[PDB]
Structures are given as structure tokens and as C-alpha cells.
Design a protein around this ligand. Structure first.
Ligand SMILES: CC(=O)N[C@H]1[C@H]([C@H](O)[C@H](O)CO)O[C@@](OC[C@H]2O[C@@H](O)[C@H](O)[C@@H](O)[C@H]2O)(C(=O)O)C[C@@H]1O
Ligand SMILES: CC(=O)N[C@H]1[C@H]([C@H](O)[C@H](O)CO)O[C@@](OC[C@H]2O[C@@H](O)[C@H](O)[C@@H](O)[C@H]2O)(C(=O)O)C[C@@H]1O
Ligand SMILES: CC(=O)N[C@H]1[C@H]([C@H](O)[C@H](O)CO)O[C@@](OC[C@H]2O[C@@H](O)[C@H](O)[C@@H](O)[C@H]2O)(C(=O)O)C[C@@H]1O
Ligand SMILES: *[C@@H]1O[C@H](CO)[C@@H](O[C@@H]2O[C@H](CO)[C@@H](O)[C@H](O)[C@H]2NC(C)=O)[C@H](O)[C@H]1NC(C)=O
Ligand SMILES: *[C@@H]1O[C@H](CO)[C@@H](O[C@@H]2O[C@H](CO)[C@@H](O)[C@H](O)[C@H]2NC(C)=O)[C@H](O)[C@H]1NC(C)=O
Ligand SMILES: *[C@@H]1O[C@H](CO)[C@@H](O[C@@H]2O[C@H](CO)[C@@H](O)[C@H](O)[C@H]2NC(C)=O)[C@H](O)[C@H]1NC(C)=O
Ligand SMILES: *[C@@H]1O[C@H](CO)[C@@H](O)[C@H](O)[C@H]1NC(C)=O
Ligand SMILES: *[C@@H]1O[C@H](CO)[C@@H](O)[C@H](O)[C@H]1NC(C)=O
Ligand SMILES: *[C@@H]1O[C@H](CO)[C@@H](O)[C@H](O)[C@H]1NC(C)=O
Ligand SMILES: *[C@@H]1O[C@H](CO)[C@@H](O)[C@H](O)[C@H]1NC(C)=O
Ligand SMILES: *[C@@H]1O[C@H](CO)[C@@H](O)[C@H](O)[C@H]1NC(C)=O
Ligand SMILES: *[C@@H]1O[C@H](CO)[C@@H](O)[C@H](O)[C@H]1NC(C)=O
Lengths: 325, 164, 325, 164, 325, 164
């Protein structure tokens, strides 16, 4: 008669590492790191993202005529801008504080387009000739932005001082846009706005703005030697905007009612396809369906994702050393 | 191991025992068989499940990078942000890998210690009534049936009875 | 005869956690984390903070007439601004680089108010009509800031070019303020400064400044459709300031001699009371009197505080497992 | 424990011994009593005080947040600062909690090891002159007074004398 | 007969620390931390740094006449600016976005000086009187920058509008500089450029610029009451620059062809000597020749250096406790 | 140590043995001498070299500071950058020092454990054929030459032969 003491073993060939030893086979281990992703964009919180398609954030939000597919209200869990989208700022110029604008739209959830200033707000000028071959729609060779209006002096007389007002009596902030036109010479400036010094001024409770033209000859971009300084702002609930200009005004026409998320919000520059699926974690590289703690796919995500890490594998040993014989 | 048990004086493991981590192979008149010590086994299971859950719990935060864009004249702050993201990434990678390696070693040492402690738990009951081969096996001098092996297993072996 | 080997035990029911096990009673442990705070503001280095009371940093530093309680010299270990202080910038406008100004005043220790430009520095204008119902004192309905002066053309003639100079021959930097007045129309501008183009210019060894008015109609704030662009700067030891303006100048009058701390310095927005007590560690949430290593009260502090952490308890086991029977 | 001593083969602890961590309960003609092994006890005390002081020492830095304000057009850098403060906060929280859990386990294992080592320190002196019950108690065959127990306690037990 | 079991020991007195114990002598240990440095600047990747000597980055890159030693092409692994270099911006003024300029030049590897606008690009003005006693060379008391040209009206007539163009048809970006002159009064402005409102304007595909003079009296610096607003930009491959000005133009003359590194790049403010030696790691404090993991010399380096750390020693025990007797 | 061996019941070390960490001093008719157990020694060497290389490997990243300059109106972002650099510096310093202290302790415990395990590896072979002094020395009852000591050393000691 006898009796022996010993330990478990099995067919497992799963290996881990320790400080003292590498490549060590154990009976039961667990993988904490996920490396598998579904290369696609899904819905978050049952809400679908926004495919900007052949439009950039600029062309979308400024109402580029070839971005009419995006026109109107939008709601998104996140935003997808396409790596080679062609439709942005068609008439040459700079959108002041563009990066901050992107950060702000990123921190968003929904917009509602509305008319903030009908063309009748601008008295005694020509609100129906403001076009250019630089900003065509899919149907004609000369249009302009859907949210702006290009004011030009009436077909004879000079440019009168024009005023506009919008009292935001609502409960939501208003994202809006305007611009200053910078002509290439004196004769163009005169042809469009007439002589005399010109100004563009805009006031709210917590923001003022004043600028004159900066007439000079620039390199040809989109067949235009002129430029436009585009500007954006947020009219808060209770704030009211005064617009006053005697010339060179690219006046706001349509604006957006903005909804702030308070949560993260993400804007992804990616070419991955958006499918009719759901997800709880969404990286720029794809979807993670895991119960694991770590992940080596991507640091950029929206939703609830594992901690990003550079490792290949994080094997943790739960069982003992395997010694079959 | 550092307690010498696993892959030491107990040179190998039993693929026969499939109902636990640590256990017994007895040998008598009614026949042999394998059976695991559920007590020390369950202790190890609870302890290790606790270790894993604690680790997963302490790792439940996420540094979050952002899609933020920086202009041509924003080189410095952009590089600042990059350096920060990279930095945190580095520290979390390090923490992860290091914690894994360390805890793995300590877990193996734990199993080893459990085996050694069981062996000692046995050797402390049977002193003169058996023969210690030195390889985790004990050859009785007297006879031992089923209610005999079972008494040893549930820790109630009566030494005075079998000392004679 | 016999002898036994064993270990300590006691009446202690203090519990700790390990990786393997939670809720484990031990004989002797120690708490490294402090969670107790005295909800008050005390003295640091035997120096007392600065209660801005019903004044904001702007209203204090610009010399708002209802902040005359703060007028003159100040010395502080730190600054306490009140969550709903009403007295800041009374006449509508923007204090350029306000955030940086707050950071700078934060990095401070003491100021000494002095007259930098007596009203005689401005020749041939009216230095005694510069008032408004927007900036009342506790005793009259129309005054202005204590540190600025509003220059208006003499009761008939036009606005002559006026000059001022201050050579900082001292060993301390000089914080000072000025402003440009932005009227609502042409007739007001003429009523106050007369016709002709106007400018405001200021030069030092390492700073120049030039600005014109930006006349336009703004929404009514404090019954004023006008604005003021407020500006601040530091005149370094050895630097000297030249002021030159032909109109629209809110001239500096009083300025401060500033003392840089080189240490941290903190500005707390809080409603906690300041008491006549001492402390070595001062968070925005209160005082910590501890010899412990960690704390879960607040990350914002001045003085010598424990490392902030999110934990509830950090119990460390010094004794062994408790097994009484 | 992993050395099997505390709450193992020595199933419980003595609330009687109040002058140390590890010690003795003797039993003879002059009467019994409790008395702690000041040597191994003081070794453990110094070691552990050193561990605690080392931890407190290595934890003696503070990441410091600031009251800095950021404007409406400073969204990005503000969020950068927030993300940084949060980040560092996360790593220090993790480091703290993890270090606590780990060091606690290792400290208990240390105490266990000390008890086991004392038991072995005793068993190595008395070999034939006593009877190992297996529960940390030894029943003499000969007689042992006070200067006898004391010799064992100060590690100078003369085995050849009492072997006969 | 007998046999004994034991362990190693030796003459070693090397000590380490543990959690439980300090000052513990062991048989074999290893030092992971390097504290030794060779106080000098060496070559990196067999490429030598750039000693700016008695010139600052400003004076170098703007072509200060006393920095003619640096004139022409340069190539560097890194840059060394001297703590008390005297030769920078000789004519008083501000180099807009200087910090960013330093960051950009830092991210560099090589420049190639070339003529971007010959003095004939500016028609009907005086391109050979643009000197000042504020910017002397080592050989005469009145010169100017080597890369700029100061345009003044012809010795009678007024200032005509002048134009210039450079089409960057090359594959490399072009760093270039210009400036606006700010006179102290009206009569100087008239003496140099004549009457009438003046402007300076510059356009590229992705950048426009417009500025007028800001005439005022400033404190004397280098015997000049005037100022110059210096500006810098990068003309990208394919971009083309239009310059147009009717006065007050400090025109670009020479510009640089810039080579972006994509790697780190470092600019060191240090007085250490540069020797004819090689190195694989280069801190601002000196060279590290080590195979060790850590270092306590400096956090600022170029090349491949150990992780910087604050520790004095990081001794790691490999052997066992030493007990000789 | 926690296994009691080093500087414990084996009170000191041998400066004579210069060909390993753990080994033997035998004593018989042909003469004495020192010789190290290359097996357990090489195991410890490989393990520890692996520990060191793993540490050095996990420490192979570098947070990098920059020479970036910030203006008079850039106080906030400058202080942000400083705070970040300092922060990361603090965490890496901590990680380093802590890892060193911890791993040192555990390494010593490892050596101790190896010595104890060797002692047990010996005691399990010789049971009645020798006398355990208790200080890591065993006094034979029978005779043992060179091919006798060598058999013990290469783990092939025939106990039944010398039991009589
Ligand atoms: C009503 C109006 O003013 N719109 C014009 C527009 C503007 O006058 C002009 O762009 C202001 O800068 O110009 C349009 O043609 C301009 C012209 O640009 C040349 O350089 C280019 O070579 C030509 O092809 C030509 O299009 C325009 O479409 O932009 C006409 C428009 O009606
Ligand atoms: C001397 C002087 O100019 N001060 C005036 C001041 C300024 O003229 C004016 O504020 C410049 O913008 O204006 C004061 O009254 C202005 C007026 O504002 C109306 O819109 C408001 O409805 C009225 O209640 C009225 O106060 C002023 O006090 O601000 C008069 C002051 O004397
Ligand atoms: C051709 C030309 O204009 N260059 C002048 C130069 C400029 O006219 C002037 O600097 C524009 O601001 O001025 C020079 O002398 C100016 C003068 O400065 C005095 O205040 C100082 O006290 C004098 O020493 C004197 O140099 C100049 O060298 O800067 C003459 C130069 O020819
Ligand atoms: C925006 O519209 C509201 C009216 O809907 C204005 O609110 C009034 O403000 C005046 C003082 O200016 C109060 O006396 C009234 O009680 C308010 N009326 C109502 C109905 O709320 C507000 O002033 C407008 N803002 C501006 C400046 O245009
Ligand atoms: C500020 O005041 C001091 C005088 O107190 C001026 O210092 C003089 O500078 C001149 C040259 O400009 C030197 O030659 C003198 O030696 C200095 N005099 C003294 C007494 O120090 C300084 O120039 C003044 N600054 C300005 C420009 O107003
Ligand atoms: C810069 O120079 C090149 C010529 O070397 C110009 O490129 C031409 O662009 C026109 C349209 O503007 C094309 O039709 C031609 O095919 C191009 N010619 C060549 C030879 O490439 C370019 O336009 C110039 N840029 C400017 C605006 O000056
Ligand atoms: C680990 O094992 C793999 C095969 O499973 C082998 O390719 C690799 O070289 C091993 N690594 C080390 C360092 O032992
Ligand atoms: C041990 O096993 C027997 C089964 O034969 C059982 O009767 C007895 O109660 C058990 N003893 C204990 C204490 O578990
Ligand atoms: C720890 O103990 C407390 C009571 O002291 C109990 O409420 C809690 O559930 C326990 N936690 C765990 C997970 O054991
Ligand atoms: C042990 O105890 C006795 C007290 O009776 C004392 O005389 C003796 O010196 C002690 N031995 C040692 C070495 O401590
Ligand atoms: C460590 O040893 C050094 C001498 O080598 C001594 O000066 C120092 O005080 C010791 N530190 C401690 C705390 O033991
Ligand atoms: C032990 O040593 C002897 C040398 O005398 C050798 O012949 C024998 O093979 C060795 N045994 C083993 C298994 O190493």
C-alpha cells in the first residue's frame, strides 16, 4: 500500500513569459489584449455617424453647392471625413480659426439649418448677382455658398450702409458664418462696391468685429485673383447680433442651431465603409467587440474601449507549470 | 519552482487528474485512482481569480487621444500634444508588460508553494506509519482501505491507531 | 514538559486588501491616505490671502468704483475670487489677453498702486468729464475706473495730439492698463473727439501698439451701445513708455508696482470663508493638516500637500494575519 | 500563508503574547507563560519600517494642477491641459493602489516565512530530545526547567547533554 | 567522513538597497544609471553642428552684417546658440512669431541661400540708399541686413507702386523674410516715402498679408526712434509669391531653400566647446558614451540616449548576499 | 533570508568556492576541496540574466523634452509644457527606483530559496546513511570515496547499498 502527492497537467501548449523565464508552457492562461478589429464604422448608442462623402467640413458647413447632399439638419454619434474629399472652400480664401471650428463641431451632436438673414435684410443693394465660376453646383457653372450671400451695389448707384439684426431668443447656440471680400485691384473694387473707404462690422454682447478690405494682387487660385476671409462665431442664447456694412460684405444667410454634447465626440479622417451595424466601441481603425482589458488597434476612439497599448500579447498565467510525461 | 516541488522533487505532473490542480493518487487493495484536494485547490482558485479581477479592475481607465488639428504656426503645441500622448502611451505599455511578467512569476511560485504545503500537510500526519520515498510518495507499513485513505484526505488520520 | 511556537493576535478588526484576497483582518496597519479637510481658507507662510469679495479680478485691477475696498496696496499668499462677484468690467468691452493676465497676477505676491500719469500729462483736453452711468460708485450714478481716465476734447475746440512718458527707473516691473473707446456712430465720435481720422499709439523698448477706433452699432449692454477695448502690459525695469494719441484714448492713470513670486501662486474661485488660522497646505476644498502621504480631497493647492489621488483608502499592512480563538 | 505556518499547521494565534510578533509558550514545573522572540521580531520590525519608509519616500513628489483659464477660442489647449492632468492622476492612482495590494500580499508572506523559519530554527536544535506533534508544539522526553528553556531561547541548547 | 552545503562569497564591498533593507553588500551587482558626461559638443551621424558664435538665430537668419561668417549654405546635425551672443536684430523691431520660427529652424537640417528678388524687381525707387548706423558691418558704420533691402523713393519724385513675383518651381520649401518700417513722425515718413496713405501687401496660394505703417514716437533703441516689424514665411513647392507695395517696404532680397528633417532636431543654448569628435548621444550638458539604460545628466538631447531620470544610483543585485568570515 | 538558508542556519559563505554560486565542500580520505553545483547555478544565472534583460528591455523608451521657447503672452502653455515634462520625469524616476528596490529583495529571496532547495535535494537522498548536524553539514556513518561523492553530486546516490 502507498499514496502519492502531485499536480495537474494537460494537452495545452499555451506559453507565457516571466522575469526569470521566457516561453513557458502552462495549463490555464488568459489573454488580456485584443488585436482583432472589424474594419468598418458602426452605430454608437444606436445613433449613426455622419459621412461627409466628397465634402470636407469646410464645404459642408459653408454650404458648398456640391455638398447639397448634406444640406439641412444632421445628427451624428461621430463624423467621418473622407481622405480625398474634393468639395470644401471653392472660392479662394482662409477660414479664420479653422482648427478651433473643427474642435467645436467635433464637440457636437446635431445641427438645424435655418434662415438667419433673408436677402431683404440688406436694403438697396443687389442680393441676386452674387455668383462666381469658382463655386459651381452640379447643374450650373456659376453659383455660390448656400449659407452666405454676396452683396453687390445696385446696377448703377453706390453702396448704401446696410444693417441686419438677429435676437437669439431661443435656448440653443447659433453657429454662423460671414466673410470679407478682398478684390485684386481698385477698378474691380469700384465695379462691385463703388469708391470710398469700406468697412465690415459685427457686434454682439460678447463679441465685436471690424475689418476693411485688403486689396492686392494674389496668385490665381480657381481662376480667381481675389480672396475671401471667412469667419465663424457662436451666438449664445440671449445674445443678439448686429451686422453693419457699407461694402465688401459676404453676409450670413443661413446658420445652424447647434447642440453641444458635453461628451467626447470624434472626427475621423478615414476611408473605411459605414455599415448598418451596431457597436459599443469605435476606433478610427474599426470596431472592437471585446471583454478584454487592453487593445493594440488604435488610441483614437469614440465609445467605451479597452486601454490602448503597444504590446503584441499580454498573457496572464492562472494555472501552474505544465509537465506531462 | 522556488519551493522545489513542481518540476523539482516532484519531477512531473499527472494528466490523469482532471478534477483539480493539486491532489492524490492512492494505491491499495480495492484499486487505485486519481482525486483532487478540493480545499487547497479552491483556495488557489479564489485567490487567483481575485488577483486577475484586481488587475483588470486597476487597469480600468483610459488615456484618450484626440483628433485635434494644429496649424502651420501651431507647430509647438501640436508637438506638445503628440509628446504627451506618446508619453502616456509609453508608461501604460511599460506598466502592462512589467506587471504581467512579475505577476506570472509570482503566480507560479504560488502554485509551487501550495504543492509543497500539501506535501508537508501530509507528512505531518503520517510520521512512523509510512515510508517517505522522497518523491512525493509514501509507502505504508500497515494496511489502508477506503475509509482509511479518506480519513487522511479529510485531514482526520488517527496516528495512534496505526502506530502499532 | 513541552514548548510551543506561535504568533501574535489581538482585538483589532482593521482590514486590508491584497491581490489574492480582499477584506483581510490584520494586527497592525497604517492609513496612507487623508480624506479629512477643514472647509476654510487659512494663512500660508504666516501670510494671508486676498478676498476679492464682491469684485472680480477685472474689477479689482481696473479700479472699479465699487471695488474701492480693494484700492491701494495688497499682499497675498493666494487669491480668492467669489463665485458670484458682481463688480468687474462695468463699461462694456473686452480685456485683451485676460486669461494670461490672470495667470500673471496669479504668479504674484504684492502690488503697490501709484500715479503713473497725472491728468496734466494730457495737454489741452478735458480730463474731468470722463464719466458714465455704466460705472457708478456707491455714492453717485456716474463715475469711471480709478486707474483709467477718459479724455474728451475741450468744451469747443478739437482734439490736439497728446503725449505722455514714464521712465521706469525703479527695480520693479509695472503692470498698467489702457483702452480704446469704440463709439456707436459718427455723430457721437464727433461729439466726443471731433472729426478727422483718430489713432492711439504706445511704444516701449520691447513693445509697440497702434489702433484706430472701430465705430459701429452694438447691442445695448449696461445701457451703452459703445465698447472699450481694454489692454494691459508690463513695463520692465529700465523700459520707458511713450503714449501718443489724437483721440479715443482711455489713458492710464494709476498703475501697479508688481512683485513676482517665482513660486507657484494660486487663484481660487471659491465661496469658502477665510478665517484667522494658520496652515501648511491649502487646497481649493480646504485645509489639510496631515503627516500622511496621499490625499483624495483636491488636486488644486498652494503650499506643501500630499499627492492627490482618486482612492478611498490606501491601507498598508505592517502586522501579520489576525487569528484569535 | 505560502510557508504554511500562519493559519495553517499553526491554526491560530495567541492573544496572550503581547510583547512581540513571534514567540513562545513554554510549559514545565515552575509554571507556564508567554514570551516573544525579540530577535526575529526586531528583524521583521526594522525590515517593515524600512519598507514603509521607502514607499513613503518614493511617493514624495506631487503633480500639480493649475487654475489656468482658457478662452472660447482656446478649446484645444484647454482640453489638452485637462487630458494631461487627468492622465497623470490616473497613473498615480493606479501606482498607489497596485503597490498597496502587492506589498500587502508580500508582507503577509514575509510574516509567514518568519514563523516557519523560527519553527525550523527550533526543530534543528532539538532532534531526539523531544516529540514533534506537528502543530508547532514539542513534547520533551527529559526534564527542562528555566535555565533550560532559556538556553533554547538564546539559541544555546546543548543537545549531547540531554540526548541520554 | 562528511559533506557540507553552502554558498559563494568574495572581497566585494558593493552595496544595494531593498524595500526591507538598505546598505546591503552583495557578490555581483550592476549599475544601470550613467552619471558621467564629456562636457563637449560632438558630431552626430558623422555630421557636425552649427556654431552660431557671436550671432543669435535672428541675426544669423536675417543676415546681420556682423554674422557674415555664417552667410551662405549651412548643414547641421543640431544648432548651438551662444548664451551671450551679441549679434541679432540690429535695427529695433519685432520678429513676428519668433518662437515658431525657432521651432521650425530647429526641425531643419540644411539651408541654401539664394537671391529671390534682385533690386531691379523694384522699379523706379532707390534700392541703394537703404542703410543705417544701427546695423554696421565690421568695416563700416552704416549698412543693413544681407537678406533684406530698404526701399526709398527716388531722390525727388514720389513712391510708385512696386511689384515682385517668385514662382517656386522647385522641389524644396523657401524660408523668406520681409518687414514693415514704422517711422517716428510725419516728416520722416514724408522724407522717405512721400505723402499719401501707404500699404504693404503679399499674396501666395495659401497666405495673404496686408499692413500699413503705425507711425508714432518710440523710446530710443540703438539710436533709432523708429521700428521694424519683421515677418517670416515659407513658400511651398508650387506656391508663388506676389509682392506689392506703394511704400514702407523692407523687401525680401535673399531667401533660403530649406530642408525638413522629419526627425527631432535640437537647438541648444550653451557655452560648451565644439570639438572634432564623434558621438551617438548628445545632451545639452555633454556627450554620453554608455551601454547603460538610465542617465541623470540631462533631459534635453539629440541622438540615441538613455532614459533621463533623477536618481543618483540604480544598483541591481545579480549575486547573493555576501557573508565572508 | 525568508527560506532561512543564507545568513541563517548556514551562517556564512565560502570565499573558497570561486567556480559558482551554490556548491559543495566534501571531506574524506583522498582529501577535501570545493566544487560548485553547476546545474542549479546555471539555472539561477539564466533566470537572473533573463530578469535583467527583461527590465532593460521594458525600460527602452525615452520621454523627450524640447528646447521650445514661449513668449511673454505664452505663460500658460509654457507652464503646461514644463508641468508635463516634470510630471513624466517624476513617474519614470519613481518606476525606476521602486522596481530596483522590489526586484533586489526578490532576487535575494530567490538565491536563498535555491540554497534551501539544494539542501533539501541532498537531504532527500541521504536519510539514514548520514547525520544531519543542522548547519548544512552531513556526517556519514559509512565510508565515501570519490566515485561516491560524485554519485551524490550527479544526483545518483544508491541508498540501498549503503543502508546496511
Ligand atoms: C457678379 C460678380 O462680381 N461676379 C463675377 C466674379 C467677380 O466679379 C470676381 O470674381 C471678383 O473677384 O468674377 C467672375 O469671373 C472672373 C474671371 O476671373 C478671371 O481671372 C478668370 O480668368 C476668368 O475665367 C473669369 O471667370 C467669376 O465667375 O469668378 C465672373 C462673376 O460673374
Ligand atoms: C461725457 C461723456 O461722453 N459721457 C457720457 C456717456 C458717453 O457720451 C457715451 O456713453 C459714449 O458711448 O454717455 C452717457 O449716457 C449715454 C446714454 O446711453 C443710452 O443709450 C442710455 O439709454 C441712456 O441711459 C444714457 O445714459 C452715460 O452715462 O453712459 C452719459 C455720459 O455723460
Ligand atoms: C537713408 C535713410 O533713411 N537712412 C537714415 C536713417 C533713417 O532715415 C532713419 O533711421 C529712419 O528711422 O537714419 C540714420 O540716422 C538717424 C539718426 O537717429 C537719431 O535719433 C540718432 O540720434 C542719430 O545718431 C542718427 O543716426 C541712421 O543711421 O539710422 C541715418 C540713415 O542714413
Ligand atoms: C431680444 O428680445 C427680447 C424680447 O423678446 C428683449 O427682451 C426685453 O428686454 C427689455 C430691456 O431691453 C426688457 O425691459 C423687456 O422686459 C424684455 N422683453 C421681453 C418680451 O422679454 C431683448 O432686449 C432683446 N435683445 C436685444 C438687445 O435685441
Ligand atoms: C530713463 O532715465 C535715465 C536717467 O535717470 C536715462 O539714463 C541715461 O541714459 C543716457 C543715454 O540715453 C546716458 O548717457 C546717461 O548716462 C543716463 N543717465 C542717467 C542719470 O542714468 C535713460 O536714458 C532714460 N530712458 C529714456 C529713454 O527715457
Ligand atoms: C509657375 O510656373 C509654372 C510654369 O513653369 C506654371 O505652370 C503652368 O500653369 C498653367 C496654368 O496656370 C498650365 O496651363 C501650364 O501647363 C503650366 N506650365 C508649365 C510649363 O508647367 C504655374 O502656373 C506658375 N504659377 C504661377 C501662378 O505663377
Ligand atoms: C519563444 O518561442 C518561439 C516559438 O514558440 C520561438 O520562435 C522564440 O524564439 C522563443 N523566444 C525565446 C527568446 O525563447
Ligand atoms: C472523513 O471521511 C469519512 C467518510 O468515510 C467521514 O465519515 C468523516 O466524517 C470525514 N471526516 C471529516 C472530519 O471530514
Ligand atoms: C468587504 O467587507 C465589507 C464589510 O466590512 C463588505 O460590506 C464588503 O462586501 C466586503 N467586500 C468584499 C468584496 O469582500
Ligand atoms: C542564555 O541564558 C542564560 C541565562 O540563564 C545566560 O546565562 C546565557 O549567557 C545565555 N546564552 C546566550 C549565548 O545568550
Ligand atoms: C549607507 O552606507 C553609507 C556608507 O557606505 C552611510 O554613510 C549611510 O549612512 C548608510 N545609509 C543608511 C541609511 O544605512
Ligand atoms: C556520476 O558520476 C560518475 C563519474 O564517476 C559517472 O560515471 C556517472 O555516469 C554519473 N552519473 C550521472 C547520471 O551523471
Amino acid at each position: 500500500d502507498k499514496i502519492c502527492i502531485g499536480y495537474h497537467a494537460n494537452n495545452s501548449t499555451t506559453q507565457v513569459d516571466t522575469l526569470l523565464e521566457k516561453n513557458v508552457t502552462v495549463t490555464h492562461s488568459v489573454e488580456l489584449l485584443e488585436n482583432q478589429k472589424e474594419k468598418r464604422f458602426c452605430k454608437i448608442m444606436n445613433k449613426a455617424p455622419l459621412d461627409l462623402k466628397d465634402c470636407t467640413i469646410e464645404g459642408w458647413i459653408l454650404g458648398n453647392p456640391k455638398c447639397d447632399l448634406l444640406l439641412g439638419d444632421q445628427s451624428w454619434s461621430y463624423i467621418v471625413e473622407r481622405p480625398n474629399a474634393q468639395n470644401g472652400i471653392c472660392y479662394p480664401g482662409v477660414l479664420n480659426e479653422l482648427e478651433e471650428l473643427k474642435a467645436f463641431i467635433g464637440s457636437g451632436e446635431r445641427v438645424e439649418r435655418f434662415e438667419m438673414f433673408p436677402k431683404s435684410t440688406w436694403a438697396g443693394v443687389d442680393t441676386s448677382r452674387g455668383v462666381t465660376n469658382a463655386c459651381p453646383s452640379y447643374t450650373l457653372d456659376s453659383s455660390f455658398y448656400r449659407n452666405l450671400v454676396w452683396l453687390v451695389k445696385t446696377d448703377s448707384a453706390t453702396y448704401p450702409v446696410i444693417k441686419g439684426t438677429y435676437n437669439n431668443t431661443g435656448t440653443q447656440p447659433i453657429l454662423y458664418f460671414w466673410g470679407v471680400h478682398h478684390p485684386p485691384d481698385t477698378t474691380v473694387q469700384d465695379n462691385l462696391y463703388g469708391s470710398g473707404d469700406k468697412y465690415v462690422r459685427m457686434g454682439t454682447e460678447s463679441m465685436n468685429f471690424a475689418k476693411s478690405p485688403e486689396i492686392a494682387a494674389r496668385p490665381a487660385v480657381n481662376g480667381q485673383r481675389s480672396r475671401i476671409d471667412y469667419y465663424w462665431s457662436v451666438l449664445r442664447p440671449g445674445e443678439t447680433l448686429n451686422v453693419e456694412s457699407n461694402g465688401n460684405l459676404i453676409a450670413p444667410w443661413y446658420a445652424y442651431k447647434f447642440v453641444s454634447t458635453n461628451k467626447k465626440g470624434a472626427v475621423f479622417k478615414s476611408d473605411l465603409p459605414i455599415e448598418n451595424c451596431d457597436a459599443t466601441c469605435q476606433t478610427i481603425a474599426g470596431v472592437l467587440k471585446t471583454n478584454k482589458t487592453f487593445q493594440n488597434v488604435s488610441p483614437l476612439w469614440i465609445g467605451e474601449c479597452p486601454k490602448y497599448v503597444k504590446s503584441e500579447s499580454l498573457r496572464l498565467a492562472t494555472g501552474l507549470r505544465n509537465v506531462p510525461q | 519552482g522556488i519551493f522545489g516541488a513542481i518540476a523539482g522533487f516532484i519531477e512531473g505532473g499527472w494528466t490523469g487528474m482532471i478534477d483539480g490542480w493539486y491532489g492524490y493518487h492512492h494505491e491499495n487493495s480495492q484499486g487505485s485512482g486519481y482525486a483532487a484536494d478540493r480545499e487547497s485547490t479552491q483556495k488557489a482558485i479564489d485567490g487567483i481569480t481575485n488577483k486577475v479581477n484586481s488587475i483588470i479592475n486597476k487597469m480600468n481607465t483610459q488615456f484618450e487621444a484626440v483628433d485635434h488639428e494644429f496649424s502651420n504656426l501651431e507647430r509647438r503645441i501640436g508637438n506638445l500634444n503628440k509628446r504627451m500622448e506618446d508619453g502616456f502611451l509609453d508608461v501604460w505599455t511599460y506598466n502592462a508588460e512589467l506587471l504581467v511578467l512579475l505577476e506570472n512569476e509570482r503566480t507560479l511560485d504560488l502554485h509551487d508553494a501550495n504543492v509543497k504545503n500539501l506535501y508537508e500537510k501530509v507528512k505531518s500526519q503520517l510520521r512512523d506509519n509510512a515510508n517517505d520515498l522522497g518523491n512525493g510518495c509514501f509507502e505504508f507499513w500497515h494496511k489502508c482501505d477506503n475509509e482509511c485513505m479518506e480519513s487522511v484526505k479529510n485531514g482526520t488520520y488517527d496516528y495512534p491507531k496505526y502506530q502499532k
